[PDB]
Amino acid sequence: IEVKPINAEDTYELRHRILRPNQPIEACMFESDLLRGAFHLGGYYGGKLISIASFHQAEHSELQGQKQYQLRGMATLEGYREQKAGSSLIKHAEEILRKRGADLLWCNARTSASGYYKKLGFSEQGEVFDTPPVGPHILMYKRIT
Numbered sequence: 001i002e003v004k005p006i007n008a009e010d011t012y013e014l015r016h017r018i019l020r021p022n023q024p025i026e027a028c029m030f031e032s033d034l035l036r037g038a039f040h041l042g043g044y045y046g047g048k049l050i051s052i053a054s055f056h057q058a059e060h061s062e063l064q065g066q067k068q069y070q071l072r073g074m075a076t077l078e079g080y081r082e083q084k085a086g087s088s089l090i091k092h093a094e095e096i097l098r099k100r101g102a103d104l105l106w107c108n109a110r111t112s113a114s115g116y117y118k119k120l121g122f123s124e125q126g127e128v129f130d131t132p133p134v135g136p137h138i139l140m141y142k143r144i145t
């Protein structure tokens, strides 16, 4: 897998295909993409963008750490899963975040992906909550200090 920087606009197709296929494309244009210091990473394989991840500074009231970042739009295309594409994006992001002096990376994880974040060393906090139309979620975080 080759990890490369990508632009916000480059994430919309895979966000739409994988995460929000039953919603208008506008639902994939996350307002958080326009928050200060937002960045995006792409995983490329065989000449195709096959994994995406987006990060921006956001301090969660129920997590402790002076500087925190949120992960949004984590997705790998069917056919290209189980190749460490997603893990490679998260590890590369952790280097960028550690260099920026971030203390923590968090995500409102789909529960169906909780085991992925667990394998990457994330812990769960709090309770499962539902967010229609995209289902049960759980706050997960990884301290990177």
Ligand SMILES: CC(=O)SCCNC(=O)CCNC(=O)[C@H](O)C(C)(C)COP(=O)(O)OP(=O)(O)OC[C@H]1O[C@@H](n2cnc3c(N)ncnc32)[C@H](O)[C@@H]1OP(=O)(O)O
Pocket (backbone or CB within 6 Å): 018, 019, 051, 071, 072, 073, 074, 075, 076, 077, 080, 081, 082, 083, 084, 085, 086, 087, 088, 107, 108, 109, 110, 112, 113, 114, 115, 116, 117, 119
């Ligand atoms: C709010 C959010 O952004 S959370 C949304 C997460 N995305 C989704 O749910 C969309 C659909 N799923 C996906 O896109 C992918 O399955 C992802 C992003 C969760 C994982 O991407 P991949 O590129 O396949 O991950 P990668 O290959 O790095 O997997 C790392 C490890 O986690 C495991 N893993 C991957 N997905 C899952 C899962 N859904 N549940 C449990 N374990 C998982 C892999 O088996 C691997 O384990 P191993 O090292 O023991 O073999």
